[PDB]
């Protein structure tokens, strides 16, 4: 497939939930589903290796990977975690990750390409699952 492209959300569903599975006190998940309706990325592809800038009104972070190759980055709430990213069909990647220190609710992400143009990215913790939906910029 080819994800690459400058990528703006349209839709967040479920990230409030995500957010209080992981700990996240109530005033704090009302900020931050707020910066999450600025949520930007940027994907660069070449072959299965992927360049991803994920950003908001105040912050940046870039997470570099090759399928099927360990990497470390951080969860959504901010612990480091060790991640591997396997693809589940043509357009669809799924990244399991592991806890590198203490414990904590099982956490996940997947990001597909729709026929219709648009990525969709999920976040799981647990039994809730957060659904955010791109378009091209
Ligand atoms: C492939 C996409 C990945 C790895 C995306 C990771 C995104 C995040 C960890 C996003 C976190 C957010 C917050 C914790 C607050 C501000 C809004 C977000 C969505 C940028």
């Known amino acids: 497939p080819n994800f690459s492209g400058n990528w703006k959300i349209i839709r967040s569903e479920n990230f409030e ?14 900020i931050a589903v707020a910066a999450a309706s600025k949520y930007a990325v940027e994907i660069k592809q070449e072959g299965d290796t ?22 470390e980055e951080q969860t ?16 669809k990647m799924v990244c399991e990750q592991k806890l590198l220190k203490g414990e904590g609710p099982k956490t996940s992400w997947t990001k597909e390409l729709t026929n219709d143009g648009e990525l969709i990215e999920t976040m799981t913790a647990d039994d809730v699952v957060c659904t955010q939906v791109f378009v091209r910029e």
């Open 17 to 30: 939930e995500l957010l209080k599975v992981l700990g996240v006190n109530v005033m704090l998940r009302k």
């Open 50 to 71: 992927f360049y991803i800038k994920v950003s908001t009104t105040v912050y940046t972070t870039e997470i570099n990977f090759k399928v099927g190759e360990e990497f």
């Open 76 to 91: 959504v709430d901010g612990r480091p975690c060790k991640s591997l990213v396997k693809w589940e069909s043509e357009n």
